[PDB]
């Protein structure tokens, strides 16, 4: 009840990779597909298996309390999963985004927050 | 009237690649050419998720001034200089030394 953490993130990730709808979620989404590329959707299996396995390299303390993660721990994780530290930093970034988002879902309404979602365009020119 | 063209095999006169031979990929307007296996640079690429581009140090081929590359004579095994004549009614290239057409 403290808030959103890597435990709930883990649950949502395993439920994700089990229920993964990339082909279906591409259909479920309409306004985002008109702007962003159609084939830009990443494969769920590889990415989410990588994420699950990398999370599995983490102790229970680094999960419930994600802000104690540092470089040496990233080394342990990367060496454990047999991958690059930049990927660990990548997944920590994605987890930061997810945490921020879910925090915004918890603070406001799901309808105000679902309608507050915006598609960023740096100009009216497409892809520029 | 352009001397060095796509797909010519050339030899490199100048630079760290002096003496090396290779095949031309393309030419650029500024008088620069890009040659196979020639003038590799190590470039750093910020990973791009839209193009699924990983990060890392990519070895790439950097343009070389066309004055520095010579058209490679396969007959003589030497670098050559090129000239133009009219055979048939068509404008054609030849090697200066053995004066044979290309």
């Amino acid at each position: 009840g403290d808030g959103f953490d890597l435990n709930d993130f883990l649950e949502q990730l395993r439920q994700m990779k089990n229920m993964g709808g990339x082909x279906x979620x591409x259909x479920x989404x309409x306004x985002x597909x008109x702007x962003x590329x159609x084939x830009x959707x990443x494969x769920d299996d590889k990415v989410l298996v990588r994420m699950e396995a990398i999370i599995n390299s983490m102790t229970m303390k680094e999960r419930a309390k994600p802000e104690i993660i540092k470089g040496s721990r990233k080394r342990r994780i990367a060496a454990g999963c047999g991958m690059q530290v930049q990927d660990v930093n990548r997944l920590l970034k994605q987890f930061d985004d997810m945490q921020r988002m879910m925090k915004k879902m918890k603070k406001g309404g799901x309808x105000x927050x679902x309608x507050x979602x915006x598609x960023x365009x740096x100009x009216x020119x497409x892809x520029x | 009237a352009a001397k060095i063209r796509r797909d010519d095999e050339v030899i490199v006169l100048t630079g760290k690649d002096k003496g090396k031979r290779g095949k031309v990929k393309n030419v650029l307007s500024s008088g620069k050419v890009i040659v196979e296996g020639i003038n590799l640079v190590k470039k750093h690429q910020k990973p791009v998720p839209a193009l699924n581009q990983p990060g890392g140090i990519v070895e790439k081929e950097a343009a070389i001034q066309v004055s520095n590359v010579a058209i490679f004579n396969a007959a003589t095994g030497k670098a050559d200089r090129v000239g133009f004549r009219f055979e048939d009614g068509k404008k054609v290239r030849f090697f200066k030394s053995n004066s044979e057409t290309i």
Partner: peptide
Amino acid sequence: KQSTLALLLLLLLLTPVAAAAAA
């Protein structure tokens, strides 16, 4: 109407975060 609405709404919060990572 309400079916597809509620259905998609349940998982609605999980999708765009992964979609943003894909984009």
